[PDB]
């Protein structure tokens, strides 16, 4: 009956420099229940090879996952993370913003 909404962050492991290999992360924390859909997107399209962490939870019992994949940032390519959960009326898409 309790539900908690995912907090979504999209970020690189290391400072992005175009043409140098990196790792693109979508961290989702603070959700309940655990059933969640998380994709990484490249130019609005689903990235196929993505890995994720083992389901764990915080002291308030809310759950957290990391989804990740190797990437090479470039100037032209857009990345995002798309999430659906019972708490969201429509899938939430958060864009990767390297300048933050």
């Amino acid at each position: 009956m309790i539900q908690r909404t995912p907090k979504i962050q999209v970020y690189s492991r290391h400072p992005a420099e175009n043409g140098k290999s990196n790792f693109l992360n979508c961290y989702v924390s603070g959700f309940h229940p655990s059933d969640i859909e998380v994709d990484l997107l490249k130019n609005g399209e689903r990235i196929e090879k993505v890995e994720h962490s083992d389901l764990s939870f915080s002291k308030d019992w809310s759950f957290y996952l990391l989804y990740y994949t190797e990437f090479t940032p470039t100037e032209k390519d857009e990345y995002a993370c798309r999430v659906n959960h019972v708490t969201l009326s429509q899938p939430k898409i958060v864009k990767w913003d390297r300048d933050m």
Binding site: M1, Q3, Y27, G30, D35, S53, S56, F57, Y68, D99
Partner: protein, 275 residues
């Protein structure tokens, strides 16, 4: 100095769709080291940290038995709980268990924890003294009577004050490379002009371990808590953490704003300035 071991179990019913999903994970401090996933092929407890891989086959056999046993008792509890709360057969519910121990700076037992949640709410939890129980609602009060009558806590206290701590000391020395380190955050602030009249100041901490950190803004030395956007500390994926805190300020006032960072790896608290 001080350290912790925790196990986290998560069981989720999917009625008519087969048996529950059961996922168990173990951590030392902020470092995961084992998993079990009931839907996986291997049906084994698996290593997830390099320093656990040296454990021999008795360990892996033993931990696999224990965790499958846990999965069975949660499987039973899902039925019990649905019973007690008068819920329909067809709907997905969640049980969660966490337990573990804390040791102090000289790696002696400090505290134990053993606790349960049902559908994301505290259910029953061992009290700090490891002899009593905290149950809020009526179902859990019923559980409490039963567990008091069967002397459940003294069995759990034995594990928490003995076995739990012995394994944690062992892991701390075998995983000394990973667990007995402190990585100070690499800090900086960014400025971005949202408009002509205001700017986002963001204070960054990167590449730090352990996860515990505090980032705060001040304006002319006055805490700016209510106007701070503070994101959840997040895994970089390489065994370090990241975190930022942002404030949106009037163009020209940047020099009034200071960022303050506290971490175990910093010799003194750090103040960053626009200057």
């Amino acid at each position: 100095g001080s350290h912790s071991m925790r196990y986290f179990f998560t069981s989720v019913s999917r009625p008519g769709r087969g048996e529950p999903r059961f996922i168990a994970v173990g951590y030392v401090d902020d470092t995961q080291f084992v998993r079990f996933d009931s839907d996986a092929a291997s049906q084994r407890m698996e290593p997830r940290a390099p320093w656990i891989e040296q454990e021999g086959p008795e360990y892996w056999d033993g931990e696999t038995r224990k965790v499958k046993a846990h999965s069975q008792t949660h499987r039973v509890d899902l039925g019990t709980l649905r019973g007690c709360y008068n819920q329909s057969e067809a709907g997905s519910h969640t049980v969660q268990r966490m337990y573990g121990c804390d040791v102090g700076s000289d790696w002696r037992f400090l505290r134990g924890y053993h606790q349960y949640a049902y559908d994301g709410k505290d259910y029953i939890a061992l009290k700090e003294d490891l002899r009593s129980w905290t149950a809020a609602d009526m179902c859990a009060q019923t559980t409490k009577h039963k567990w008091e009558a069967a002397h459940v806590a003294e069995q759990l206290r034995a594990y928490l004050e003995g076995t739990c701590v012995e394994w944690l000391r062992r892991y701390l020395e075998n995983g000394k490379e990973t667990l007995q380190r402190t990585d100070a955050p690499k800090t900086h602030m960014t400025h971005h002009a949202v408009s002509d009249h205001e700017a986002t100041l963001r204070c960054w901490a990167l590449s730090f371990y352990p996860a515990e950190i505090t980032l705060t803004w001040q304006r002319d030395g006055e805490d700016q808590t209510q106007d701070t956007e503070l994101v959840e500390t997040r895994p970089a994926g390489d065994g370090t953490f990241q975190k930022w805190v942002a404030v949106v300020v009037p163009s020209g006032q940047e020099q009034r704003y200071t960022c303050h960072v506290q971490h175990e790896g910093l010799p003194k608290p750090l103040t960053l300035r626009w200057e």
